[PDB]
């Protein structure tokens, strides 16, 4: 409440003065304007904070609030004399002096929408779901076994090896060079996808793509570090809507280029690289905040953590997060290889990865909107609902693991979208039973530890299944063993329930 809360209630009160008649109650409005203006005169603004006080470049702030309070006097001396439009003219003069004097020392007045403008243009990647048909296509001439057993295990090991340092580096450098590194990593992914020659180029591509998917936690923490804590809810809602709209618009653009527009995959990756250059240009113009999380102590965190370690509905959901996240990402990293195996058509327009991606994003947004409304008590209904969701997941993975006829691949696509629903129904709810119990530093620590052990379990299962020197199984038997794993999870949660 240094300058920003007083400034926003001043703007709201000026809107109240603008849209009201019957001027008996505009005197309270003008004196609240005066109180909010005089409270922010000694505010010491953050862009002026680096400068020394009693400086000749500081008195412009006090002179601007001086003429501001003077025009508040000129407005209020006419509001008591029965005049109702002269107060509006003085409010217009107050608006002109607001635009002239004060807004130079204010930071920026589109910091919501520009982040929305970063939530959209940094998510337009129309060749996201079309990476795997670009590999198996006639351009790069990769086989199915080499992309199944060799390329994506490097993605798993690299995702562990960049989940270890880059979270601390994300919380360290105040989140702007980390998003810049994420944009440069996307640029590296599509440059190694365009200029690829052999398997090792694609392995380095999966290293940088693991950097991109590991830097996904940076955006919400950047919102929390930029936006004041009493405005975080609405701005976070607009930003999540912007991210979902960007992903859905990216997938719809991929369908409109590949299917309808009849655009080749090289030109598609060229357009994707162009949108990534726009993303890098927009990421260069991001303001670096100051208040980080783990750098702006440890015994206090342990004392606040130990009061809820033996609390129920926190350890079971953590183990569910680990197990179902490992299984879910191991299904997502191979569903495209399975779809290219079942439907190996040479037609580029016959590939419908973008339509399934758009339907997945839409159903995930619907089941995430239908997740906070779940007012089901968790004393007895916990393990039964989790057992039903894991049984549905095992049924859908077993449904994907037997389809070998080509013309039923349509019957695969939306079915996997249902699997894309079956996790996204319980993404906020697993948040709601974890994040609503501890402090925000402890919340970030608990979710980081859960994601870290989820990546450990996923790396162990990748080392067992898709080892180039161990099993080396094809992706059909991989989905069969994944269906066995989800069946074992369903048996465990059914034995826990009843």
């Amino acid at each position, epitope marked *: 409440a240094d300058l920003e809360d007083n400034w926003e209630t001043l703007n709201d009160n000026l809107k109240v003065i603008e849209k009201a008649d019957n001027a008996a109650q505009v005197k309270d409005a003008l*004196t*609240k304007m005066r109180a909010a203006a005089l*409270d922010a005169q*000694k505010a010491t603004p953050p862009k002026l904070e680096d400068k020394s006080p009693d400086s000749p470049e500081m008195k412009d702030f006090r002179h601007g609030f001086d003429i501001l*309070v003077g025009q508040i006097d000129d407005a209020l001396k006419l509001a*008591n004399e029965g005049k109702v439009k002269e107060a509006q003219a003085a409010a217009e003069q107050l608006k002109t002096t607001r635009n002239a004097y004060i807004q130079k020392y204010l930071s920026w007045r589109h910091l919501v929408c520009y982040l929305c403008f970063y939530g959209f243009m940094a998510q337009i990647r129309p060749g996201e779901s079309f990476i795997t048909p670009y590999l198996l296509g006639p351009d790069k001439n990769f086989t199915r076994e080499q992309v199944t057993n060799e390329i994506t295990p490097v993605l798993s090991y690299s995702y562990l090896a960049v989940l270890v340092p880059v979270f601390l580096l994300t919380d360290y450098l105040r989140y702007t060079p980390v998003l810049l590194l994420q944009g440069l990593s996307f640029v590296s992914v599509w440059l190694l996808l365009l200029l690829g020659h052999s398997v090792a180029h694609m392995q380095l591509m999966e290293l940088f793509y693991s950097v991109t998917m590991a830097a996904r936690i940076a955006y919400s923490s950047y919102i929390f570090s930029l936006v004041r804590p009493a405005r975080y809810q609405r701005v976070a809602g607009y930003s999540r809507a912007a991210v979902l709209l960007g992903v859905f618009t990216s997938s719809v653009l991929g369908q409109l280029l590949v299917t309808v527009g009849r655009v080749s995959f090289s030109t598609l990756n060229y357009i994707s690289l162009a949108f990534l250059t726009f993303s890098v240009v927009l990421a260069l113009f991001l303001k670096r905040p100051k208040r980080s999380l783990f750098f702006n102590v440890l015994a206090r965190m342990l004392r606040e953590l130990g009061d809820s370690l033996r609390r129920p509905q926190l350890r079971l959901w953590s183990l569910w997060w680990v197990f179902n996240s490992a299984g879910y990402y191991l299904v997502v990293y191979y569903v495209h290889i399975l779809w290219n195996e079942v439907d190996p058509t040479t037609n580029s327009a016959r590939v419908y990865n973008g339509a399934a991606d758009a339907a997945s994003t839409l159903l995930g947004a619907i089941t995430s909107f239908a997740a906070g409304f779940v007012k089901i008590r968790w004393a007895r209904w916990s393990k039964l609902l989790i057992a039903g969701v894991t049984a549905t997941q095992a049924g859908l993975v077993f449904l994907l693991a037997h389809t070998r006829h080509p013309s039923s691949i349509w019957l695969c696509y939306a079915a996997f979208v249902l699997f894309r629903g079956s996790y996204q129904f319980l993404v906020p709810i697993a948040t709601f039973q974890i994040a609503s119990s501890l402090s925000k530093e402890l919340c970030a620590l608990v979710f980081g530890v859960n994601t870290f052990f989820a990546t450990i379990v996923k790396t162990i299962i990748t080392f067992i299944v898709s080892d180039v020197r161990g099993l080396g199984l094809p992706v059909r038997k991989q989905f069969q063993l994944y269906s066995v794993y989800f069946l074992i999870l369903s048996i465990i949660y059914f034995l826990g329930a009843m």
Partner: antibody
Amino acid sequence: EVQLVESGGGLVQPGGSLRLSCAASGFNVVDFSLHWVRQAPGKGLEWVAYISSSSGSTSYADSVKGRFTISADTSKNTAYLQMNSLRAEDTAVYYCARWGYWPGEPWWKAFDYWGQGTLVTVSS
Amino acid sequence: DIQMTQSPSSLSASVGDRVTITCRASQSVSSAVAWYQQKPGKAPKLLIYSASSLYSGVPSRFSGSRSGTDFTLTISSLQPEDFATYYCQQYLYYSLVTFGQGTKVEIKR
């Protein structure tokens, strides 16, 4: 030194009239605005009215609105407070105080040099 | 229009006792309030202005503190001259002068 003085106070009748003089020795009334503060005997301080001789934006209290009036002359360097149809509640001591203009430091300074204050009473 | 409450309306202390007088506003009035000292019979005098600054003429044993809408006067060493009535007055505009009730300090006996 600069100071204030009040004159013209005494005893009146309910429904009568009385004019009060507030003379400022030293400073002028165009550089500092003048205020009137009521103090009932036994009660606390309360505000009546003001005048700014530069422009003129005389606003009153809710209990004296439309009943009292104020007029300041800068040639005689004084302020007159005229009261007609006085009620019985107005038996009090009236202080005439100085207060500065926005902008600057003399606005943030409060009523610094109060006057001696006159005594008015309304009785039948 | 707005109210300006003042809770310790009857204090009592001896020579050498730190006393505190609180004053609560109704709206979010900024750092512009006044503390006044009125001897019995005489005129009030400016003691504290702008809720933190000391007026030139009164000693250093008078102070003040703003905490939101709570203005607090603190007297460290109670001089026997300082037995008077202390008033709280928010000043924000020419026509929004609302005084407090008044705190009459007494001698501890």
